[PDB]
Every structure is written in structure tokens, then in C-alpha cells.
Amino acid sequence: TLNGGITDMLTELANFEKNVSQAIHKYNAYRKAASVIAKYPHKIKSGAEAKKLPGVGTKIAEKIDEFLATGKLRKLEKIRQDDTSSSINFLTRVSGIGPSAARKFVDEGIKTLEDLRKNEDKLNHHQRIGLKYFGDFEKRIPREEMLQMQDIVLNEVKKVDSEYIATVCGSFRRGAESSGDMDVLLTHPSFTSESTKQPKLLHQVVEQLQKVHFITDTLSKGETKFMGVCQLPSKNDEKEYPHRRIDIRLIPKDQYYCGVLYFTGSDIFNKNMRAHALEKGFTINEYTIRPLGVTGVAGEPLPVDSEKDIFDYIQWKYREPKDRSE
DNA sequence: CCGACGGCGCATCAGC
DNA sequence: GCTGATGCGC
DNA sequence: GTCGG
Ligand SMILES: Nc1ccn([C@H]2C[C@H](O)[C@@H](COP(=O)(O)OP(=O)(O)OP(=O)(O)O)O2)c(=O)n1
Ligand SMILES: [Mg+2]
Ligand code: NA
Ligand code: NA
Prior knowledge:
By secondary structure, the protein is an alpha+beta fold. Helix content is 46%, strand content 13%. α1 (4-19) packs antiparallel against α2 (24-39), α6 (85-91) crosses α7 (99-106) and α10 packs across α12. The longest helix is centred in the middle third of the chain and has 18 residues, at 143-160. It is globular and about 60 Å long. Bound molecules: 2'-deoxycytidine-5'-triphosphate, magnesium ion and sodium ion (2 copies). The site of 2'-deoxycytidine-5'-triphosphate has 14 residues, from α11, α13 and α14. The chain binds 3 DNA strands through residues 13, 17, 23-30, 32-33, 54-60, 95-101, 124-126, 170, 181, 183, 219-225, 227, 247, 249, 262-263, 265, 267, 270-275, 277-278, 283-287.
């Protein structure tokens, strides 16, 4: 909020390069600088002052100078005018529609919300649902609602099997007063890093959550991952609650610490961490942390009994979830 | 001053 | 059907 | 786009 201007701008360029140009790296490089500048405790009064921070080279330094002076960015103004580019940007705002399929829709004439509605037969299942709820999916979930969702997820999970453990990670675990979606990490003793004693472990909780009408729809669903839609029950005469996005990851009981580390994010944080890990000589995934051998090859999984053990290996002083919102 | 750039589950399509 | 590259997401 | 080899 201190440098809302500069951050917002760079966030926009990021979407452009990601959606239109299909430049994932330029996308990443643009948002990293968004985070560092957002973290920066001073109202930046110069593109030079900005270049100092990591992830902020000279291009972004020149843009920051322009923005500071004019109040706008010509490069961004022209992208807004360009009907094709600003037509893809909109399609990607639908879960299931990435940079490619969006560009493929422009090439077929499908460019607006009403075009997708009439050509629903052109969309795959995920895109179809992403469209159906598109309106709702733009609305952020307040903490109060997040809490009510926690009870239901946990209380239903317990009813299936008491040995289950569900952890609402994401922006929730980071103490955000508002979340984008609902990320739910799940563990059960029957599923560990070398032995699986029960085939339908995730199917059980999903099925249950559906039977209680909490899980309205199902985007994707594997045996360890689930993307879907849920919605808090409503009272009488009250307008229904917006349908919400709910991810449900099932990590092996013994790898929890690595799993929660990931599912807690933020993604920028995980990127900056796994990058640094790689520099320190380690590769951190949502499963384990391993050494990068002598030939670069990832060695055997190192022992972790807490989140801190991970920060320790890479020589990073521990940081609470409330401080991982980058 | 030229390129590399965190990691992975599901869904989907291609070649066999 | 199985293997792998590719979209798209978290 | 940035930044390190
Ligand atoms: N490419 C990515 C994207 C996300 N994540 C992490 C960051 C999050 O902790 C979690 C996914 O959660 P969300 O995508 O729902 O986003 P957040 O929960 O971080 O924020 P919010 O939902 O408030 O927008 O996985 C990651 O490691 N790599
Ligand atoms: Mg989330
Ligand atoms: Na810099
Ligand atoms: Na999308």
C-alpha cells in the first residue's frame, strides 16, 4: 500500500508477459520485484533507489522513473488499447484457460464473457466450471468465512476417520484477513513415504464433503490432489454464499513439514526459498529436502522434524508464516 | 554480457 | 493401453 | 527482466 502504484504496474506487466507473450520467466522476474518493492519500507522516490533492491534491474528502473513522473506507463497504456492483447488477458481470468487456449479462442472469434457462454461446448470440463463460477471466483473470502470453512472441513474429516489431520494452509496460515481460496493439507497414518495401506484415502473425504453439500463441484481429482468448488451453507431468506475454490493436497504423514512449508507459501516465498536452497546446495520440493550431490544430482532425503530444520539446512533464520507473505 | 530461471499433480492430446 | 510432451494450477 | 559466470 506504500508503493501501490509501482507494485500494481509491475504486476500488470507480469500478467501481460505471462498471458500474452507467454514469457514465464519475464513473468516471474516482474513479480519478484513486485514483492521486494512491496516489502520495501519507504515510498520509493526514484528508479535508482529502486534498482538497489534485488530483482530490480535497469528496465524496471526506467519504468519506475516514468511512472513516478507521468503517473502512467506508455508501454502499459498501449497494451490496454490493443484489443487482441487485452482480449487474451480477460480469457485467462477463467480457471482452466491459460495463455494458449485463450489465444486460440481469439483466433476463433471467442473474445468475451458472452462468447464463452454461447460456445460452452468448445470448453473442456475445468474451463466450463471456471466460467460457471467466474463471477464468484473474483471475490475474496474474509477470515470469518475461512474459519467457518475450517470447522466443516475438519469436523467432516474426523467423521470419516479420526486419525486424519487437516491443515488449512495458504494465506490463511499466514494470518491474512482475507484469502483467495481454501488450501487444505491432509495427512493420514495409512499413507507414508514408502507404504500405502489404503487406496481411497482422498476419495473418502471428498465424497463425504460432497455428501454434506459442501463440495459442489470437482475441477481435477487425483489420488493425492484435488481442485474443486465448495460453499458455506446459508440460513433462511439469506442470499447464498459465493461458491469458493478449494484445493486439497494429501501429503504422506512423515513428510508433513515439507508439505506444509509448500502449501503455506507464498509462491513468491517458495520461489525465493527453493532458489536459495539450490544455491546452498539443496533442492526443496513439497515432499522433502535433498542435497545436490557432487554432480548436481539430488541425493537422498535429509531428516526433518520441523519446519525450522528446513530453514536451518539452507542457513536461513526461521520466519513465521505471518512473515512469508511475499 | 549471454542465458539460465522452483517443483510437481491432473488433464489432454499424439504417437505407437 | 502405455509413454511422454504440453496446458494449467497450486 | 535480472543478474551471475
Ligand atoms: N507455483 C506455485 C503456486 C503456489 N505455490 C504455493 C503458494 C501457496 O501457499 C500455495 C497455493 O495457494 P494459493 O494458490 O491458493 O494462493 P495463496 O493461498 O498463496 O494465496 P491466496 O489464496 O490468498 O491468494 O502453493 C507454489 O509453491 N508454487
Ligand atoms: Mg490460497
Ligand atoms: Na537490482
Ligand atoms: Na485462467
